[PDB]
């Protein structure tokens, strides 16, 4: 189904920060030396973590796991929940809970893309830390400055909410 989260996520001018519509994304890291992060390229495609809006009566963790399973067939039982990062949000009215999880590196080998996902990409955390990070800043209506990030990885452009979550994960 269509999710408002995907609309706001593609809004080039929607600002994301951390500090009424609720959503969650799964931030799965492989259990290895140089951890890889599970990311998707939606059917240039929108780069995002598996995720979506919470259904009624559903928690952030349940949503994140369901979305990863619906999108790339990631079995929730393959995920060890590590807790969550701080919520990231945008003025318009979206609160996103990044749910952290750890999976075996092998788990990636058998994931299966569904129609809404074009490909699965797995940047290594080392790589994302080494890429020439783009740091811009915009000001909100209240006059508050806010940092914007963009990770130029292998020709792809990871930006917006996803990059904000990524940067927080890296810090
Ligand atoms: Mg969905």
Curated annotation (Swiss-Prot):
EC main group: hydrolase
Superkingdom as given in the UniProt entry: Bacteria
Residue ranges annotated for the Nudix hydrolase domain, each copy included: 20-162
Binding site for Mg(2+): 67, 71
Family classification: Belongs to the Nudix hydrolase family. PCD1 subfamily.
Protein name: Nudix hydrolase DR_1184
Short motif (Nudix box): ranges: 52-73
Cofactor: Mg(2+); Mn(2+)
PROSITE patterns named in the record: NUDIX
GO biological process terms held by the UniProt record: coenzyme A catabolic process
Keyword terms, alphabetized: Hydrolase, Magnesium, Manganese, Metal-binding
InterPro entries with a match to the protein in the record: CoAse, NUDIX_hydrolase-like_dom_sf, NUDIX_hydrolase_dom
Subunit structure: Monomer.
Record keyword Manganese present: yes
EC number: 3.6.1.77
Taxonomic source organism: Deinococcus radiodurans (strain ATCC 13939 / DSM 20539 / JCM 16871 / CCUG 27074 / LMG 4051 / NBRC 15346 / NCIMB 9279 / VKM B-1422 / R1)
GO molecular function annotations of the record: coenzyme A diphosphatase activity; magnesium ion binding
Catalytic activity reported: CoA + H2O = (R)-4'-phosphopantetheine + adenosine 3',5'-bisphosphate + 2 H(+)
